[PDB]
A paper describes a structure:
Evidence accumulated over the past two decades has identified [name] as a main coordinator of cardiac muscle homeostasis, and its dysfunction through genetic mutation as an important factor in cardiomyopathy. For this, we examined the unique mSNP T2850I in the I-band domain of [name] [name], as a paradigm of an alteration in a general component of the [name] chain. Domain [name] does not support specific interactions or have any known specialized roles, so it does not constitute an a priori sensitive locus of the chain. In previous studies, we have shown that the [name] mSNP destabilizes the affected immunoglobulin (Ig) domain in [name], [name], and speculated that this instability increases the vulnerability of [name] to proteolysis in situ potentially leading to myocardial damage.
Author numbering:
A (entry chain L): 2 to 91
B (entry chain A): 1 to 91
The structure:
């Protein structure tokens, strides 16, 4: 394809109190890119703890009922790009 | 066993909403980590600001923003060779 896939905006680090919801969002250059999220470099295990949202080129990860266990670096991956930010559960 | 095969476990509902209001469909599937596929009249929806696609565990949801009469259609969630359809009527 004419234009190369990349992740456009960067992602800010977030701090949330325990039990509150945390969200990460990023945007990509192309439609029809699948979401792929890592926690500390490893694919997140899908469960009712995580909501994955896509709207247009916006990809969101929603982390429910946070605990100190959720404090980590989260990464979105597509093509040859990736973007990371930290969650601190307070 | 039945769990060796991916399948729809809970259907979505027919729905009516007034113009410009938000509409949503929710179904459930048998397994975690299933991709979402949504159709509008048999054809894959085009990703845009119009549609929010949500997966939470086994729950799959399509949210249709700012409805218009052009949104009135049969929507389908596709789970491999398994499908579920329901109608949005924008009134
Ligand atoms: Ca970038
Ligand atoms: Ca079925």
């Amino acid at each position: 394809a004419m234009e190369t896939l990349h992740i456009t905006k960067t992602m800010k680090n977030i701090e949330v109190p325990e039990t509150k919801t945390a969200s990460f969002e990023c945007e990509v250059s192309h439609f029809n890119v699948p979401s792929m999220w890592l926690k500390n470099g490893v694919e997140i295990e899908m469960s009712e703890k995580f909501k994955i949202v896509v709207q247009g080129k916006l990809h969101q990860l929603i982390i429910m009922n946070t605990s100190t266990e959720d404090s980590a670096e989260y990464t979105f991956v597509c093509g040859n790009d990736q973007v990371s930010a930290t969650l601190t559960v307070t």
